[PDB]
Scaffold this active site. Sequence first.
Site, PDB file in Angstrom:
ATOM      1  N   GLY A 115      -0.022  -6.268  41.110  1.00  0.00           N
ATOM      2  CA  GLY A 115       0.328  -7.381  41.078  1.00  0.00           C
ATOM      3  C   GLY A 115      -0.161  -9.128  41.594  1.00  0.00           C
ATOM      4  O   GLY A 115       0.113 -10.181  42.193  1.00  0.00           O
ATOM      5  N   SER A 196      -3.263  -2.442  35.927  1.00  0.00           N
ATOM      6  CA  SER A 196      -2.318  -3.558  36.317  1.00  0.00           C
ATOM      7  C   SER A 196      -3.399  -5.167  36.782  1.00  0.00           C
ATOM      8  O   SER A 196      -4.236  -5.314  35.773  1.00  0.00           O
ATOM      9  CB  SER A 196      -1.241  -3.428  36.997  1.00  0.00           C
ATOM     10  OG  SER A 196       0.286  -3.946  36.923  1.00  0.00           O
ATOM     11  N   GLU A 323       5.712   0.769  29.818  1.00  0.00           N
ATOM     12  CA  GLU A 323       5.392  -0.811  30.486  1.00  0.00           C
ATOM     13  C   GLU A 323       6.195  -1.415  31.278  1.00  0.00           C
ATOM     14  O   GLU A 323       6.698  -1.620  32.408  1.00  0.00           O
ATOM     15  CB  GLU A 323       4.664  -1.632  30.257  1.00  0.00           C
ATOM     16  CG  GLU A 323       2.638  -0.518  29.007  1.00  0.00           C
ATOM     17  CD  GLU A 323       2.008  -0.346  30.645  1.00  0.00           C
ATOM     18  OE1 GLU A 323       2.111  -0.200  32.054  1.00  0.00           O
ATOM     19  OE2 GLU A 323       1.006  -0.548  30.093  1.00  0.00           O
ATOM     20  N   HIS A 436       4.947   2.303  33.475  1.00  0.00           N
ATOM     21  CA  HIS A 436       4.072   1.600  34.693  1.00  0.00           C
ATOM     22  C   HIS A 436       2.744   2.252  35.628  1.00  0.00           C
ATOM     23  O   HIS A 436       3.420   2.190  36.837  1.00  0.00           O
ATOM     24  CB  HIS A 436       3.912   0.740  34.628  1.00  0.00           C
ATOM     25  CG  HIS A 436       2.901  -0.545  35.025  1.00  0.00           C
ATOM     26  ND1 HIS A 436       1.840  -1.090  34.289  1.00  0.00           N
ATOM     27  CD2 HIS A 436       2.405  -1.361  36.328  1.00  0.00           C
ATOM     28  CE1 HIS A 436       1.477  -1.845  34.493  1.00  0.00           C
ATOM     29  NE2 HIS A 436       2.176  -1.974  36.115  1.00  0.00           N
TER      30      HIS A 436
END
Length: 527
Positions: A115, A196, A323, A436
């Site tokens: 992230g 990601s 996901e 994910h």
Amino acid sequence: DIIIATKNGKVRGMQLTVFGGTVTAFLGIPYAQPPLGRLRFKKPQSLTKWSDIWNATKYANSCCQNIDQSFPGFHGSEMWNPNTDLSEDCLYLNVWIPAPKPKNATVLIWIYGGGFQTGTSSLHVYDGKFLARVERVIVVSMNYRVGALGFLALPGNPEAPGNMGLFDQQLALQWVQKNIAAFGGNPKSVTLFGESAGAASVSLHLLSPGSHSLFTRAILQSGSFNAPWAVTSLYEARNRTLNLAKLTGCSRENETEIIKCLRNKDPQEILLNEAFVVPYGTPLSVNFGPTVDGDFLTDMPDILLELGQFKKTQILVGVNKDEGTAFLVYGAPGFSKDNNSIITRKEFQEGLKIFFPGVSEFGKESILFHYTDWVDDQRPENYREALGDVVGDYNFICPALEFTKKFSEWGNNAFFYYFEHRSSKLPWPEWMGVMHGYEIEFVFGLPLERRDQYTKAEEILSRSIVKRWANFAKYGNPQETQNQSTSWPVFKSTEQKYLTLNTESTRIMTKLRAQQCRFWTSFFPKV
Ligand SMILES: *[C@@H]1O[C@H](CO[C@@H]2O[C@@H](C)[C@@H](O)[C@@H](O)[C@@H]2O)[C@@H](O[C@@H]2O[C@H](CO)[C@@H](O)[C@H](O)[C@H]2NC(C)=O)[C@H](O)[C@H]1NC(C)=O
Ligand SMILES: *[C@@H]1O[C@H](CO[C@@H]2O[C@@H](C)[C@@H](O)[C@@H](O)[C@@H]2O)[C@@H](O[C@@H]2O[C@H](CO)[C@@H](O)[C@H](O)[C@H]2NC(C)=O)[C@H](O)[C@H]1NC(C)=O
Ligand SMILES: C[N+](C)(C)CC(=O)N/N=C/c1cc(CNNC(=O)C[N+](C)(C)C)nc(-c2ccccc2)n1
Ligand SMILES: *[C@@H]1O[C@H](CO)[C@@H](O)[C@H](O)[C@H]1NC(C)=O
Ligand SMILES: *[C@@H]1O[C@H](CO)[C@@H](O)[C@H](O)[C@H]1NC(C)=O
Ligand SMILES: *[C@@H]1O[C@H](CO)[C@@H](O)[C@H](O)[C@H]1NC(C)=O
Ligand SMILES: *[C@@H]1O[C@H](CO)[C@@H](O)[C@H](O)[C@H]1NC(C)=O
Ligand SMILES: [Cl-]
Ligand SMILES: [Cl-]
Ligand SMILES: [Cl-]
């Protein structure tokens, strides 16, 4: 004893036994000056040569970051938390080379996701020794700054210009260019790969001119820059820099004196206030991420993509079947990892409120309308599966497919995959499916370890994936040519063929999530 003379000094590695052979590991080579003191929030500075034998025999510090504390003692979450000491002194990378030392080995450079606020290259599922042993490639991975410490932006201002974590990555790619031939690597045959936010980072290197000359090819696992979480706008970027400043009592009028104030703050103080710079957030919120800084990123990336301003080369792009499920148990009502999470229409509607906080009523109405025209209308998991598909289609699959269409329209070979195998060792429950991040262990070849309790069919699938990835890196073509494998067709904007990866039968299909992506890509950006 293997000592390698690099441009900044000598480094000593370790030997490891892998599948009855040997890999040489150099864990924890510095690639930049530690970004401490007056260097915090600045671009990474180049490193000053040392005269000793730097001992690269243990993973280095991970970069400062908040940790996932939502399921203490649960391997499904804790397998992602940092496994070395957190520190600002974290600009280090790792090298796995085959034994005996190769001659012109293709290089694979891994960029982890998280992230843009968490992650570390030392994780067990990112261990490059398997790829080095099996495919005779060199695997490089690096730590890069995350959170505000890596992406705080006061655009234009070099005290905090934004994108520092991207420049950390780029300075590592540079290190490979200057140093990898000493390890037996071919600097002219470098493939970036990442997952990601790591995949989104790889896609931003395809657009950044300063990275054009630092790699050959790119692999994008479950991520791309055009995903809605991946780029922060200048307006909310400075709102967040400012909000962080008031939260730490660092509000000033000299924008530079704000930075000087934030530089005297302890890393923990910055970390605890990172979450509150946004008025409302979601389990996918990226408070501090990439911005259009005018340096790494010269323009809005959607514009560059649309107008063909990027590195012309091959790409390999893909996504997993489920996901979106991982995020549902971090806030959506009615969900839990410890029951089948069957939810009502109202809980689904409440769920949309959590994943689309700033979106209008009509916008949420329109999501419900497109994802709840059921075939059976009586299946009790209808709404549970719909919320997961919403989060996955909006945040990962539809952006990945749109990136691939737009990139291939400029003449480059592209390959798309759809990963639909659920690991036999997946610790999350079955209803969360092919989650994910749970193709990574297959890419890195962990099911090749017969002792690690994977099925035989998972070994076979992993061996095939590892071969396809390495043929892509070596030759630009992700075929498995020896075992009568399904040929992987090129993905074109016309036919949109993609390959499915499963233990059963790999298949060529066309037009993944056609109806869903028309909604997300052509209607939803208007609301
Ligand atoms: C931009 O920032 C302002 C600042 O508000 C912050 O709100 C919290 C997140 C907190 O962490 C503090 O730093 C600030 O008070 C936002 O304005 C606020 O909006 C929300 C409602 O949406 C609410 O907290 C207050 O009504 C507002 N506060 C102030 C001082 O105006 C604003 O929403 C942010 N985003 C945009 C797009 O402007
Ligand atoms: C699935 O579980 C959720 C989570 O609530 C808790 O979860 C477990 C760990 C259990 O040990 C208990 O503490 C709870 O059941 C349930 O969501 C809760 O549902 C009821 C009302 O429906 C209520 O306790 C709370 O409002 C809910 N908590 C939330 C939304 O966070 C959910 O109902 C369970 N579903 C099934 C099918 O069993
Ligand atoms: C895919 N994989 C397995 C590599 C991920 C991983 O290993 N860790 N994942 C981290 C993460 C965290 C957040 C947000 N956390 N915010 C919080 O308050 C939570 N806390 C307490 C501050 C940590 N968002 C995203 C993310 C955002 C957009 C797209 C994809 C992921 N990822
Ligand atoms: C580096 O490793 C060698 C080999 O074991 C050891 O003797 C030496 O003390 C180490 N150097 C440092 C600075 O730790
Ligand atoms: C490695 O290959 C490149 C081209 O890919 C070539 O120019 C270079 O000289 C080679 N180096 C070797 C074989 O050491
Ligand atoms: C204060 O702001 C001015 C611009 O108004 C800037 O040039 C100066 O460097 C700032 N002060 C310090 C100590 O940097
Ligand atoms: C191909 O099949 C053989 C068995 O005949 C197996 O040993 C080998 O690992 C397979 N290779 C790939 C790339 O799957
Ligand atoms: Cl499906
Ligand atoms: Cl219904
Ligand atoms: Cl539509």
